[PDB]
Amino acid sequence: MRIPLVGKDSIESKDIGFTLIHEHLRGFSEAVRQQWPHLYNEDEEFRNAVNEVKRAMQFGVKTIVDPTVMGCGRDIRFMEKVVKATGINLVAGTGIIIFIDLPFYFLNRSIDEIADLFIHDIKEGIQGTLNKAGFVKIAADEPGITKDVEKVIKAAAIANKETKVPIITHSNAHNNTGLEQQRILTEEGVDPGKILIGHLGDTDNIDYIKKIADKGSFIGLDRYGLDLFLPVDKRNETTLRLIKDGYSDKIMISHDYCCTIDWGTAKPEYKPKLAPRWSITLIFEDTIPFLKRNGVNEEVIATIFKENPKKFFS
Amino acid sequence: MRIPLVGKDSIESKDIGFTLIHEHLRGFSEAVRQQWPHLYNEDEEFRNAVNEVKRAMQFGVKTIVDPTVMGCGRDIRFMEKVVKATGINLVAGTGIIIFIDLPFYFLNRSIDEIADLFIHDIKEGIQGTLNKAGFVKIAADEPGITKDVEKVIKAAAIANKETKVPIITHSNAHNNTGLEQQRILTEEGVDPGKILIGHLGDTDNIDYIKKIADKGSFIGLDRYGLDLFLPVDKRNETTLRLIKDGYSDKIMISHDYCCTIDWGTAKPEYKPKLAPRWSITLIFEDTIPFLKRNGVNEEVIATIFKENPKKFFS
Ligand SMILES: [Co+2]
Ligand SMILES: [Co+2]
Ligand SMILES: [Fe+3]
Ligand SMILES: [Fe+3]
């Protein structure tokens, strides 16, 4: 019974079914929400999350993997309520999202101490519940591999070696952070096939993407719907090029959709094409249809959304 | 009725009495505590805070100012319970402690939006209660005045100009951050006498300290008890030198004691003199007695602990 699920008994990885590997039921900054609760509306967040999950299930999604962790407001009790309302298979994780330095708590603390937090969540449970973490999430972005970023990467390696759960990353597609994450993890003894290097869909530098896939890790053509990083069409072109080039067995596709996020809204940009609705089902309305009529068959779709997650969690 | 108090009616500034201007009932990283509650024990924190406050009151402390804000785990409900248990006058504040960048929430948000959070806490109340903030707290440290640090400083200026509450700072005594905070705030129209530049007691560069006091702001000879920054004796010498040099009317003394903090414990260092017990009453056991027998009279003590806080909040 490999994979722990929020609010359910654990399931064998072979039964994961059609999976969205990188979605967020909700995201927020823990410190801002604790200090200024007036900014938030949990009931609206809950309604939005339930609606999106139901829509995903209507398109045949069986399992959602939610890599919300420390820094983005992971709340296992909110997740379990969404499960109760929908019946979705939901995989929660553990980890830390930082781009520069760790919080003040971590002053004078070792990599082992950080790893112990992840292992606690995997083996004992999350936030005082018996819901266990099924993967580790880590990050790097524009600042690159800082001292503290490297500490978290190495802690994730320790957690993987002890518990065998896979690792999902956040990277910046325009620097080499994804490649660096992969290298540091594999040097620490992590199987490359247990790593998903995230946010690679943000670039059309296909050689960089192929380099990571060729080293053995899954490539996250996630953020489907955020044209800020790269338009859906260019993403689609990149996705289609990778498929016709033979990389289906390394491709993971998701939206990285946040049913509710607290980030300020950026300046809008309007293109000659009307922006597709970023949602947890955009790949069913745009990407998958775009793919199909470009010649890619059902077996490729099954590889990306079923076989690849199965392997990842196997 | 100038100064709001946690769990009490507001008091006139003239009735503040003997005040500890910079103490923490509790500190923690919001994100770490939300994600790994197993690391914390609120009942122990509560017992420790109540014990320390009671001991302070036995030495004649009437009012404690607690500059725990976003980044250090401000919790108004915990504070109100401590008030109920002790009867202390407790002044809570608003603000943000960052050293480099703001949390992800603040992407694409203006200085005005940040100021609005502080003004909400001052005028409406803290964390969904009717307990209001009586000052703004801001920080800068080893990284200096970063873009985001400057945004928070300017937001504090807006809050002060609108509400007239004073500003307490965290600075690094070994760079010019305190001087920079003072300059930026005064350029934005903040009265220098409404600013306390914190952590200046960490240095024995008296000329730097005098420079800040001479520009009109209070000088925080806080961290009494943390020999890491500077031994008590050297602090005492610095404090005594400043007094005999005429700076009593700018000096503010506190411990910056945290009844419970979640920071990892640093490598211990042992000096020929046994380390004095860092606590909220160390100045009653060491500093004030050290001062008195060095010739400083009761009027100086009243200036530092009564008249100066009165002015600050007037
Ligand atoms: Co990400
Ligand atoms: Co400080
Ligand atoms: Fe994400
Ligand atoms: Fe402090």
XYZ file of C-alpha atoms and ligand atoms in Angstrom, chain A residues 22 24 67 137 199 256, ligand 3:
7
model
C 1.006 19.313 -9.597
C -2.859 23.400 -5.434
C 2.624 20.015 -3.544
C 8.681 19.274 -2.412
C 8.220 24.393 -14.275
C -0.093 24.209 -11.247
Fe 3.111 24.764 -7.554
